[PDB]
């Protein structure tokens, strides 16, 4: 309707058009104007004029104090890193160099820098520059451990809970345990002087540290300890983080009743305070889609990951580790959802995009490449089977042969040989060797995959049963070991029935294997029965996936805080 522009917006464009002459005076403007002048430079595409000021710590500390427009700063900063200027590396180094210059100074300035280091390091941790946020927090931690005043131990843990968050996302787990041990040094000493600091965010990081190393028995131990310290007076960001990590640790313990009430509360709790276009809300959705994918609620799990990616594709620009983690999670879910269809074009595009981002920003010998290379390799081996060309089949399998063994070494070097991720990479090699006509190597991988999954996790688990069916399918379809596949097919189904009932989608690949099991040895009476069971599974499968999208499943105000924790704790 041709609404005239505000005099404020009109004066933004006039100052930006005369930026070079007045670049010194803009730095003396109020923070709300100063961010808007700098945001207009990004909108005009003048990233070099804008990026030459974000490289300065004092200027960036001023635009970090505009808290409401952080969704635009996270998008200018990401556009700057993609533009080719290392503002995250400079600001982390410029702060650390400046931080080390006030070590002998007074405690009045030494506390202002920690305030600057928490809004800067917390921004880089939010933006996904964990290798650079860690350098900021290590300087903030060094400030807390010089003068032994009462408030300093209250902040040294507050560094060590964020120093531990920037090492979990950076996969520095072997420094993660050293950080938590360092956190208790100031936590115990603070508790001595009549002040019990709240161990809620600190214990929640181990719920993600130990889950990442697949110490599920150990992670659930600290999952309970984290939620015992949740208080209604805590920040929502701290509370939301614990509920996500608790949900992640509860699902992998093969218990789902307690997990749904936590994450669904967390999705609503993040959608209330933050909104539907916040990085923290997208963090819940990826953890919420972690629930749906594992509990076989796969049809709506793609939308949750797609919703999470759409938030991160807007806030976090083009090439970010937070966009990449959303891509590699959506690609796996699109792999799982479209596994029955056999078409992998959206899934491969997301999987290729995730590795195209991680390889650009992270080193080629980094642990987050293990999950991204794995997801694409599962897609690559399934595209070549579905296509008819033999040369493409013999190349994509070898292309996926590169990724799994490259991924396996990353898991073996970091997590060790005896761990779930290492065993989970063996199971993918078991699928891989089966499709590469190397049948004898596929068996010894599956036996090694089970004997590790069965050992640490236990006899009855989702992960071990999912790989038994692959071993059962190997003994059945091609290498003609029908005497051994019978007990493995039933073992996989029995565990699947126990945790998922008849709605588990993998029973189709188990019932069809059982049909093939008896068509070559005899006992045709069970073929009719299992076909009926497959028929019984078929129409029962078409009863629950038609439920509405999980975004509105949480609804509005379903439950309340300090009650979901209590409901979880008693059970």
């Amino acid at each position: 309707e041709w609404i005239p522009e505000t005099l404020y917006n009109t004066a933004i464009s006039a100052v930006v058009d005369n930026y070079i002459r007045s670049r010194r005076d803009i730095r003396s403007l109020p923070e709300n104007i100063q961010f808007d002048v700098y945001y207009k430079l990004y909108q005009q595409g003048r990233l070099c004029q804008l990026g030459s000021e974000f490289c300065e710590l004092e200027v960036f500390a001023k635009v970090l104090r505009a808290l409401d427009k952080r969704h635009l700063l996270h998008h200018c900063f990401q556009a700057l890193m993609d533009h080719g200027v290392k503002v995250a590396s400079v600001l982390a180094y410029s702060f650390s160099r400046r931080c080390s210059y006030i070590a002998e100074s007074d405690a009045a300035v030494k506390e202002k820098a920690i305030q600057v280091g928490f809004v800067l390091g917390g921004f880089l941790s939010d933006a996904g520059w964990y290798s650079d946020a860690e350098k900021v927090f290590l300087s903030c931690l060094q400030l807390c451990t010089l003068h032994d005043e009462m408030l300093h131990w209250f902040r040294a843990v507050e560094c060590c809970v964020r120093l531990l968050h920037v090492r979990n996302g950076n996969c520095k787990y072997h420094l993660g345990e050293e950080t938590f041990k360092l956190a208790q040094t100031y936590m115990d000493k603070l508790s001595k002087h009549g002040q019990q600091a709240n161990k809620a965010a600190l214990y929640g990081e181990l719920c993600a540290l130990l889950f990442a190393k697949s110490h599920y028995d150990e992670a659930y131990k600290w999952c309970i300890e984290a939620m015992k310290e949740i208080t209604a007076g805590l920040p929502v960001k701290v509370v939301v983080d614990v509920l996500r990590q608790a949900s992640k640790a509860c699902v992998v313990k093969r218990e789902f009743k307690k997990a749904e009430q936590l994450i669904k509360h967390a999705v609503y709790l993040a959608r209330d305070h933050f909104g539907s276009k916040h990085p923290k809300y997208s963090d819940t959705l990826l953890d919420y889609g972690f629930y749906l994918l594992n509990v076989d609620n796969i049809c709506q799990s793609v939308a949750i990951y797609q919703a999470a990616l759409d938030i991160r594709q807007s806030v976090f620009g083009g090439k970010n580790i937070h966009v990449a983690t959303a891509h590699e999670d959506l690609a796996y879910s699109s792999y799982v959802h479209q596994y029955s269809s056999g078409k992998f074009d959206n899934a491969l595009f997301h999987a290729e995009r995730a590795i195209g981002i991680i390889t650009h920003i992270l080193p080629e010998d980094h642990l987050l490449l293990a999950s991204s290379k794995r997801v694409k390799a599962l897609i690559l081996e399934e595209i070549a089977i579905d296509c008819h060309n033999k040369e493409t089949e013999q190349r994509l399998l070898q292309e996926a042969h590169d990724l799994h063994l490259s991924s396996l070494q990353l898991a073996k070097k970091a997590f060790g040989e005896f761990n779930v991720q290492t065993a989970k990479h063996y199971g993918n090699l078991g699928r891989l060797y089966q499709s590469m006509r190397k049948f004898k190597e596929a068996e010894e991988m599956h036996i090694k995959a089970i004997q590790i999954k069965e050992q640490l996790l236990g006899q009855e688990d989702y992960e071990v049963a999912l790989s038994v069916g692959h071993l059962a399918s190997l003994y059945n379809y091609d290498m003609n070991q029908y005497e051994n596949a019978e007990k493995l097919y039933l073992r996989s189904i029995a565990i699947g029935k126990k945790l998922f009932g008849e709605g588990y989608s993998g029973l189709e690949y188990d019932y069809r294997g059982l049909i093939k099991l008896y068509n070559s040895i005899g006992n045709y009476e069970k073929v009719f029965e299992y076909h009926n069971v497959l028929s019984n599974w078929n129409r029962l499968r078409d009863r629950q996936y038609s439920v509405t999208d999980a975004l509105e499943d949480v609804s509005t105000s379903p439950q309340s805080t300090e009650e979901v924790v209590q409901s979880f704790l008693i059970s």
Binding site: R374, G427, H470
Partner: peptide, 7 residues
Amino acid sequence: LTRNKGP
């Protein structure tokens, strides 16, 4: 589709 999804 002779097997299951990847873990």
